[PDB]
C-alpha cells in the first residue's frame, strides 16, 4: 500500500524528542509528563505514513534495526547534549550496518535566549557527517515539519 517510514527519534534526555514527536503528531506542546505514533502525512505530492519510535533511557538494537531514519536530537542550552550525538551516530551505523544511514541533526529549543551552542557549531557537525542540519523549537513549531519531512525524503533517495 502507501509507503510506511519507520523513524526513531534519538537524543539525550530532556533534548526535546518526546515534545518535537507530539508537536508533530497532535500539534500539542509538552511541558511535563511521564511511545508509538503514527500519522498521514503528504510530502512532495506523495502520500505516506509516518511511524515514530520515540526512545527513553537505558534499556536497544531492536529499537534501531526497525527504524528506516533517525533523528539526533539535542538542545541549544544544554552543552553536554551536543557532544552526545557523536556516540548516537557512532551507534547508529553499527546498528544499521552502514554508513550512509540517512539522518538529520536537530537543535531544538531555538525558541528559548541562552544559546550555549552557536550556531556555526552544529552545522559543521553535520556537514562532517554529510547530514543536514536544522534548527527546532517543539513550543513554536518551527522546523518541526522540516526535520521529519527532510528525513523522509533522505530515505526515498537511498532507494
Ligand atoms: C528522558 C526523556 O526523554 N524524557 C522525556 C520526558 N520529557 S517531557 O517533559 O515529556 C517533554 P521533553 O521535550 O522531553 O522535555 C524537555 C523539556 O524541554 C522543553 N521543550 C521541549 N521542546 C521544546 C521546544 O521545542 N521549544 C522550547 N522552547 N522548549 C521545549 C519541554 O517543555 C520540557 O520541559
Known amino acids: 500500500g502507501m509507503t510506511e ?77 551536543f557532544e552526545d550525538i557523536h556516540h548516537y551516530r557512532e551507534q547508529i551505523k553499527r546498528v544499521k550496518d552502514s554508513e550512509d544511514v540517512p539522518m538529520v541533526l536537530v537543535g531544538n529549543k531555538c525558541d528559548l535566549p541562552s544559546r550555549t551552542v552557536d550556531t556555526k557549531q552544529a552545522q559543521d557537525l553535520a556537514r562532517s557527517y554529510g547530514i543536514p542540519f536544522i534548527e527546532t523549537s517543539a513550543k513554536t513549531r518551527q522546523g518541526v515539519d522540516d526535520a521529519f519531512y527532510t528525513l523522509v525524503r533522505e530515505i526515498r533517495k537511498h532507494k
Open 5 to 81: 517510514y519507520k523513524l526513531v527519534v534519538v537524543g539525550a534526555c530532556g533534548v526535546g524528542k518526546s515534545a518535537l514527536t507530539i508537536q508533530l503528531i497532535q500539534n500539542h506542546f509538552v511541558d511535563e509528563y511521564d511511545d508509538s505514533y503514527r500519522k498521514q502525512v503528504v510530502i512532495d505530492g506523495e502520500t505516506c505514513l509516518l511511524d515514530i519510535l520515540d526512545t527513553a533511557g537505558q534499556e536497544r538494537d531492536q529499537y534501531m534495526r526497525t527504524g528506516e531514519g533517525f533523528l539526533c536530537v539535542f538542545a541549544i542550552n544544554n552543552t553536554k547534549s
